[PDB]
Amino acid sequence: HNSQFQAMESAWRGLKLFVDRTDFRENNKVEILHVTKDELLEDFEFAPETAQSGLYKHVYSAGYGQFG
């Protein structure tokens, strides 16, 4: 019931509720990215354009913008 424990328990046991329900045999995969919410806006402040950000690398280019 601590603010460091419970916020890091709901953010992780709630993932298990997303893993247990979704049938991974029926063509499903899920990627897990460790950011923090204050880091992510800084990472959009990092690049001059959203098409060169660090989250753009993991959403677009490592996935969708990739051969195969």
Binding site: K37, L40, H58
Partner: peptide, 12 residues
Amino acid sequence: PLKTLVVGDFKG
């Protein structure tokens, strides 16, 4: 597969 990317604070 319908791939999703769960993003968010997962460590302390």
